[PDB]
Design a protein around this nucleic acid. Sequence first.
DNA 1: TTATGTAATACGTCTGTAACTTGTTCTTATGTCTGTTATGTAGTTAATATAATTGAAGGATTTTAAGA
Length: 109
Amino acid sequence: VIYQFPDNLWWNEASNQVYYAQDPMKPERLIGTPSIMQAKLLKILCEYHPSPCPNDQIIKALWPHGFISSESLTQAIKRTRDFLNDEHKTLIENVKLQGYRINIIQVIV
DNA sequence: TTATGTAATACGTCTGTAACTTGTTCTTATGTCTGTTATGTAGTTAATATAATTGAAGGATTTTAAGA
């Protein structure tokens, strides 16, 4: 499964790599491999789309086994925003009292 | 003997948690202004009428000022 984001950002879940490319089959500028919980968060954001994911479910998915301090949620999002160079918060948007949504240009299956 | 290659071990270290902190954004409690009704104040009334008032009660002794 291949995911396109704004600004020609391509994420490959099978190989789990994110990079800049005009052609999905030909990486141009490699960003690299996100961490594990980063992959979980990305998959959650891509798996409720078009609808956003409620905070309780992402909380229960990122750290299911132990209830974690709340800040970690937001902090994890920061890194998932930062690794995908989403400085303008255009890849992860936050809808108040609704959750977190991701922007997908297209999916290649 | 000495290269070699595994293995213990100690130290960086990349990343996941969490603390400190601010934006800002929304909600609510409060202080204030304004309009209406109830309260509080005040002035006037034109047959004539012209020295209260109500009790209350078997006290027994002292000392001290006024009156003569």
